[PDB]
Design a protein around this ligand. Structure first.
Ligand SMILES: *[C@@H]1O[C@H](CO)[C@@H](O)[C@H](O)[C@H]1NC(C)=O
Lengths: 48, 48
């Protein structure tokens, strides 16, 4: 009714972006090795 | 002259020698001209 109601619904367009659709993935980091050594003479244990 | 020492790694090596602890000396039971020089019903060894 004139001078009444007049309800406004607005659709603001904030932004348009070109998003990414990820495929495969994996993880990685920084690694360092540690070694334990044992020296045995021949015919000792499995020194064959 | 120390206490227990815990280690992060076990790096150990063995070197051979000719000290008495490196030799396994044995003898037979019932062996002629040896200790326990009597008839045996079983073939067994003896420490020396
Ligand atoms: C002596 O060496 C290992 C023990 O460290 C043993 O397994 C091996 O059979 C022995 N060798 C012989 C009896 O010839």
């Amino acid at each position: 009714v004139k001078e009444d109601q007049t309800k406004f619904l607005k659709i603001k367009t904030v932004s348009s972006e070109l998003s990414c659709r990820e495929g495969q993935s994996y993880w990685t980091g920084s690694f360092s090795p540690k070694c334990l050594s044992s020296r045995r003479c021949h015919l000792v244990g499995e020194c064959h | 002259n120390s206490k227990k020492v815990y280690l992060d790694k076990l790096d150990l090596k063995t070197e051979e020698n000719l000290l008495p602890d490196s030799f396994v000396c044995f003898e037979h039971k019932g062996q002629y001209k040896g200790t326990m020089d009597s008839g045996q019903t079983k073939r067994e060894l003896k420490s020396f």
